[PDB]
Amino acid sequence: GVLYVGSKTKEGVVHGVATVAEKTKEQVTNVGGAVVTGVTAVAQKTVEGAGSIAAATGFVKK
Amino acid sequence: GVLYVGSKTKEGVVHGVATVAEKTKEQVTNVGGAVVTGVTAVAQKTVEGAGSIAAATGFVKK
Amino acid sequence: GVLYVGSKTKEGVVHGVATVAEKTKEQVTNVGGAVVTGVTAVAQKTVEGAGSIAAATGFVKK
Amino acid sequence: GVLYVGSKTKEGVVHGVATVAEKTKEQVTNVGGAVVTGVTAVAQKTVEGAGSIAAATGFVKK
Amino acid sequence: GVLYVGSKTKEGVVHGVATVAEKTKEQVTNVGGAVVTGVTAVAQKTVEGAGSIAAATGFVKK
Amino acid sequence: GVLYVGSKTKEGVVHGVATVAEKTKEQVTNVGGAVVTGVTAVAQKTVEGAGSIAAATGFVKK
């Protein structure tokens, strides 16, 4: 297969992931896995052959 | 197969994921998996061959 | 396979991952896995052959 | 007197004076006097106190 | 008197005077006088006290 | 009097005077007088006290 990506960008501004929290008690922030950010972002064949990407989070409060 | 992507963008602004929380008690933020953000974003064949992407979150409050 | 990426960017500004927390008690920030940020970001074949990327976080409060 | 000029210009293109001539015999081009060209052009008190600006052209064909 | 000029220009292109002639016999080009060209062009009190600016051109063909 | 000029220019391109001639017989180009070219061009009190600026051109063809 052939994958061609072509961009001609002028004055491009990108914000990938933003998180804001205020006046809380507990804070659990998890940003992971396969996060691709850019002006020209390409993500091909992220998982191949019985792969795994968890990006999980546990929370037990006793 | 052939996949051609062509963009001619001028003054392009992108916000991928935003989260705002105020005056809470517990905060559990999970951003993961396959997040692609850009001015020209391409995601081809994210999962192939019995793959897995969880991006899960557990919450037990006892 | 052939993957061609071509960009002609002028005055491009990218913010990958941002986290803001204020007036909290506990702070758990986890940024990992496969985070790709740029003006031209490419991520090909992140996981191959029964691989694993956890990017997990545990939280037990007793 | 008070003269205030304020401009906030973005991507401004100005062409002051253009002259095109083709397949002629005689060519007499005269550009003078008080020609002001710009993105923010101000011309105050061009002539004061019995002044003179001719910007003339003569043509005698015998 | 007070004359205030303020400009905030971004990507400004200015062409003051242009002259094009093709396939002619005689060519007389005269550009003079008070020609002001710029991105912020100011011309104050060009002529004062019985001054003179000719910017003339003669043409006699016998 | 007070004359204040303030400019904040980014990527500014200026062409003052251009002349193009092709396939002619006689060529008389005269650029003079008070020609001011720039990104911030100011011309104050060009002529004062019975001054003179000719910027003339004669052409006799016998």
Question: Could you explain the architecture of this structure?
Answer:
Chains A, B, C, D, E, F: Cu cation binds at residue 15. Chains A, B, C, D, E, F: It is found in: Cytoplasm; Membrane; Nucleus; Synapse. Chains A, B, C, D, E, F: Residues 1-32 are annotated as: 4 X 11 AA tandem repeats of [EGS]-K-T-K-[EQ]-[GQ]-V-X(4). Chains A, B, C, D, E, F: Sequence repeats lie at residues 7-21, 22-32. Chains A, B, C, D, E, F: Keywords: Acetylation, Alzheimer disease, Amyloid, Cell projection, Copper, Cytoplasm, Disease variant, Membrane, Metal-binding, Neurodegeneration, Nucleus, Parkinson disease, Parkinsonism, Phosphoprotein, Repeat, Secreted, Synapse, Ubl conjugation. Six copies of one chain form a homohexamer. The first copy, chain A, has 62 residues and is mostly beta strands. The first copy, chain A, is 0% helix and 56% strand. The first copy, chain A, contains no helices and seven strands. Chain A has strands spanning 2-7, 13-22, 26-31, 34-37, 40-44, 47-48, 60-61. Chain A starts with a strand and ends with a strand. At the D-E interface, strand 1, strand 2, strand 3, strand 4 and strand 5 of D face strand 1, strand 2, strand 3, strand 4 and strand 5 of E. Strand 6 (47-48) of chain A pairs parallel with strand 6 (47-48) of chain B, so a sheet runs across the interface.
